Structure formats: C-alpha cells, structure tokens
C-alpha cells in the first residue's frame, strides 16, 4: 500500500482552532510547507512534537516565519528521532542569526538523509557560516544542495565553503548570490570547485561582486565541470571583457551548460558577438538571459543572425530591458517565422512601439512558426497593436501564453483581443494583463470570457 499526503499553506493566519486541526497532518505528511503563516516559538514546540512521530516526512519548508534562533532550535530537535527521513529543509527568511548556527551545525552531523538545505535571507555572518561548515565537513553530512543567498557573508566565508566542496563528491548545487564575497571570495570558491570531484549541476553567484578577472576563474569551472547545467551570474560587472574570458570555456566540447543567466552584466553589442559564437557552436545551451544589458539594436541584429542559421538550438531568450527599438523587430520577425527551436521570447521593457510589435506579429503569423510564450510587457503597445495581435492569435496556433502587462491599452484594444481569444479555434491558455486600466464593463466581459472559456487564464 501507499499513503502520500502533502500540506502547503502560504500567507495565512492560523487560529488556535485551525492549528489543532493541522497537527495530525503534521504527524502524517511527506511534505509540509508553512510559508508566512505567523509561526512563533510556541508553535515550533508543537511542530517539534508532531515531526518526532512522523516517519514519512521528506520535505519541511518553514520559510518567512519569525522563528528566531529559539524557534529554529525547537524545530531541529523535532528531526532528531531515529525515524526521521527528511531530505529537504528550508528555513529561508526565518530570523536565524549567527547565534543559531551552533545548533544547526551539530544537527547537520546527525541527518544523513538530508540532501537540500535553504538558509537564504537569514543574517548568518562569517562566524555563523564558519561554525556551520564544521558540521558540513562531518562524513555524516550528505548535503548536495545549499542556498545561502543574502546571508551577510563576505570573502572570509569562501575558504570554509571551498573546504566543504572539496569534502563532498556528491555536491550538486551552491547558491551564494547577494553576498559581497567579491573578487577574492569568488576566486577561492572556484578553486574549491576545481579541486572537488563533485559533479556540480548549478552554481549561482548573482550580485556577488564577481569581476571581469573572475571570468578567467569561472572559465576554468565551465571547462572543468561537464555536469554543469546552470550558471547564474546576473548583476555583476562582467563587461564585454568578462564575456571574452568566459566564452572560451563555454566553447569547450565537454561543456553542456543548459542555462546561462547573465542579466545586468555590463554586456554590450561586442560581448553579444562573443556569445553568438557560443550559441552557434553549442546546441546544449537552451536558455539565455541577457535582460537589462545595453545590447541595443546591433546586439539584437547579432542575436537574430545567429538564430537564423543552423547550429543554435536556443529554446528561451530573455532580452527584457536591452535597449531595443522598433528597428530590431524585422530581425526578430524573421526569427519567429523561420527558427524552429525558439519557444519563448521575453522582450519586455523595450521601446518596440506599435511598429515593432506589428512586425513581430507578422513573423509569428507565418505558417510553420513554433513560438509558445511571448512576453511584450511595457513595449509601448497601444490599441493599434491589438488588431495585429488579434490577427496573429487566429493565424498562429503554437502560442500558449502572451504577456501584454503594463502597456497603454484600454477598452478598445482589449475588446479586439477578446474577439480573438473567445473563439474555439484560439488555443491561447494564458493572457497576462497586469497594470492595465479597463472599465467595469470590460471587467464583466472578461469575467464572462473566463467563465465561458475556463481553459484560458486571464491574469491581473
């Protein structure tokens, strides 16, 4: 037999009466998530007792509760019975401090089933982190995934983390985004990964003070870890020079990196050129974010050129806020008309205008087009554009999701979209319309449409 139960509560105030009703579920569920539910120390003692008797528990997520160091202590005590099989634990945003790290460190020595630990948004500091790493070095610690985003860590934390990476051949994911670990901290971690036999799958160092020179360090990692699937380096001053030092590693035959997150990295049309050589050579690279880089219309041309030749098998391109204008849209139009791999284009927050959007609609309207998701939020789309969009919604049949949020539409534009989406032959599943003013009359028509066609989700 099999009996699998899960409980996932978010952003609810839980009365004493509801809490009493939940306790037997806490004793039974494989998965318990109680996110932003106002949990206090006293509830942490109930949680502790319930988990002591739960032989089924594999996942516990208490993020965004003011547990504090005392609260976390009580919850960890609940994991210390011989029956505990927890595999995943999140204590993100739980008011945990350096003062709670001793108790977490000792616990982590005694939970060999535990594979994933989320400690982000907790003020741990370097001393707490160092104390933690002592537990993590224990042969009984079998952690594979560790998230330490916004933990108040500096370069002093990187030596301890490098030592944990060296000790764990089974390590899969490290996130240290939003800690000012800086050039020396990034170098020390990279050496740690290079030294380690771990088949690492994901590394995230976004907003870490990663520098252009650190791209030589990361080059080494991308060249060295054929297991690496995801590399996220957004909000660092990498520059075109950084791209030039990274791209050699990305071009190694052994690299099969799937996802590259380099939004807001100081990249321009020139680094975009370096990346286009990678796109053309590496069909493994499926998802690319260049959002918030000043690529301009020349960056867009270079990307689209590569997207129009055999080689590139990119599936999702995120190019929101890239300083694109209407003048790049004939190139993206050809891409949508011809490229059979690209399924998702996020081009929000670009001044494409009605002219540019109209051109996109022309390419996507061509028979044989495959695009599934198109994000066109804040692209200066007016009611003019809506006739083109309405036509494309009936001519194209691959699109499943369309985002038009935060554009200057009103009732007349939306009416035209409605007249297309209402039809049985329109197969659109999601239409995103945040931040758009429509009348109470349009609101009712939308609610009517929702009710008459529940397969279409209209989000606002």
């Amino acid at each position: 037999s099999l009996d699998i139960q899960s409980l996932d509560i978010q952003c609810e105030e839980l009365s004493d009466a509801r809490w009493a009703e939940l306790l037997p579920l806490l004793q039974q569920c494989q998965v318990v998530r109680l996110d932003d539910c106002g949990l206090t120390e006293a509830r942490c003692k109930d949680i502790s007792s319930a988990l002591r008797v739960n032989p089924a528990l594999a996942e516990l997520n208490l993020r965004s509760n003011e547990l504090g160091d005392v609260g976390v202590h009580c919850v960890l005590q609940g994991l210390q019975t011989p029956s505990c099989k927890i595999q995943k634990l999140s204590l993100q945003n739980c008011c945990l401090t350096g003062a709670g790290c001793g108790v977490l460190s000792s616990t982590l020595r005694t939970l060999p089933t535990l594979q994933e630990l989320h400690l982000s948004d907790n003020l741990l500091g370097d001393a707490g982190l160092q104390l933690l790493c002592e537990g993590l070095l224990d042969p009984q610690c079998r952690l594979e995934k560790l998230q330490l985003e916004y933990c108040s860590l500096s370069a002093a934390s990187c030596e301890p983390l490098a030592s944990v990476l060296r000790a764990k051949p089974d390590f899969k994911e490290l996130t240290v985004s939003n800690n000012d670990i800086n050039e020396a901290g990034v170098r020390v971690l990279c050496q740690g990964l290079k030294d380690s036999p771990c088949q690492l799958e994901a590394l995230k160092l976004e907003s870490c003070g990663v520098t252009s020179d650190n791209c030589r360090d990361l080059c080494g990692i991308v060249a060295s870890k054929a297991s690496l699937r995801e590399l996220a380096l957004g909000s660092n001053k990498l520059g075109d020079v950084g791209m030039a030092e990274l791209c050699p590693g990305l071009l190694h035959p052994s690299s099969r990196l799937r996802t590259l997150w380099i939004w807001e990295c100081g990249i321009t049309a020139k680094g975009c050129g370096d990346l286009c050589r990678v796109l053309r050579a590496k069909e493994s690279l499926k998802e690319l974010s260049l959002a918030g880089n000043e690529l301009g219309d020349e960056g867009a041309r270079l990307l689209c050129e590569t997207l129009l030749e055999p080689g590139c098998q990119l599936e999702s391109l995120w190019v929101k806020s890239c300083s694109f204008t209407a003048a790049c849209c004939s190139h993206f139009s050809s891409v949508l008309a011809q490229n059979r791999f690209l399924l998702e284009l996020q081009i929000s927050n670009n001044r494409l205008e009605d002219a540019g959007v109209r051109e996109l609609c022309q390419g996507l309207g061509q028979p044989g087009s495959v695009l599934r998701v198109l994000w066109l939020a804040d692209c200066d789309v007016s009611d003019s554009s809506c006739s083109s969009l309405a036509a494309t919604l009936l001519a194209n049949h691959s699109l499943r999701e369309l985002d038009l949020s935060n554009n200057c539409l009103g009732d007349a534009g939306i009416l035209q979209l409605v007249e297309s989406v209402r039809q049985p032959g329109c197969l659109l599943e999601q239409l995103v319309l945040y931040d758009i003013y429509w009348s109470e009359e349009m609101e009712d028509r939308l609610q009517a449409l929702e009710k008459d066609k529940p397969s279409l989700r209209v989000i606002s």
Partner: protein, 126 residues
C-alpha cells in the same frame, strides 16, 4: 471581487510604516496575491488612510496613461512603496526591489460610489 476591492488588495497598505524595509515587497506581493501564475512586474502600495486615497477621486482630473479622461492626481504627496520585479526573476521565484518614497499618486475612479479602481502613476513634482 470588484476592481474597487482589487484596488484595495493590490494598492492599499494604510497600517504599515512609510519606511518599508528591503524585504517588504517580497512579503506583500505574495500576501496580496500578485505572484500567482505570473509575477506582477511592478506595483505600488499606498501608506495612507483609505478615505484619503478615496478623496483623490474628487481632486485634480488628469489624463490616464491609456488616454482615458477619468484619472485624478492627489492634491498632496503620499507615502508609497514601489515594488519592481528584478531582471533575474523567474516564476515562481518573484524577487522585488522595495523603494519607499513620497510622491503624488494618480488613480482612475469609477462607479457609484465614485472610487479608485486603478493605480495609474506616481508623480515627483517636489
């Protein structure tokens, strides 16, 4: 849910302090159901009494961004917090930058009673 109650859900936070901390938007955008299905890209909360925001409907008439007539700019600057999704965010991980400030607000108003149903813009004119 009226667009009038929706305006309250998405834009009113009377009881909170003006000086929002860096984690306010991640919390509130979630609590007020603007991160379900898709991450709402930008949103503004107003830290003023509900009646004060409602009165704006009887203040200076201005043109809405979409060219409709019935928007109104507040007489006075109000304590607001802007929430803006980061360029790295990917559903279901919606991260927001929090920016509290004092600005005039522009809302659209509709109905009987005549009430805010849309947050249009904020204006820094001082």
């Amino acid at each position: 849910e009226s667009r009038a109650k929706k305006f309250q859900r998405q834009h009113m936070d009377s009881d909170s302090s003006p000086s929002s901390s860096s984690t306010y938007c991640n919390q509130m955008m979630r609590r007020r159901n603007m991160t379900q299905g898709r991450c709402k890209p930008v949103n503004t909360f107003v830290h003023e009494p509900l009646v004060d925001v409602q009165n704006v409907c009887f203040q200076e008439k201005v043109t809405c961004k979409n060219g409709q007539g019935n928007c109104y700019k507040s007489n006075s600057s109000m304590h607001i917090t802007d929430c803006r999704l980061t360029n790295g965010s990917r559903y279901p991980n919606c991260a927001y930058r929090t920016s509290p400030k004092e600005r005039h607000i522009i809302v659209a108003c509709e109905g009987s009673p005549y009430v805010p149903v849309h947050f249009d813009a904020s204006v820094e004119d001082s």
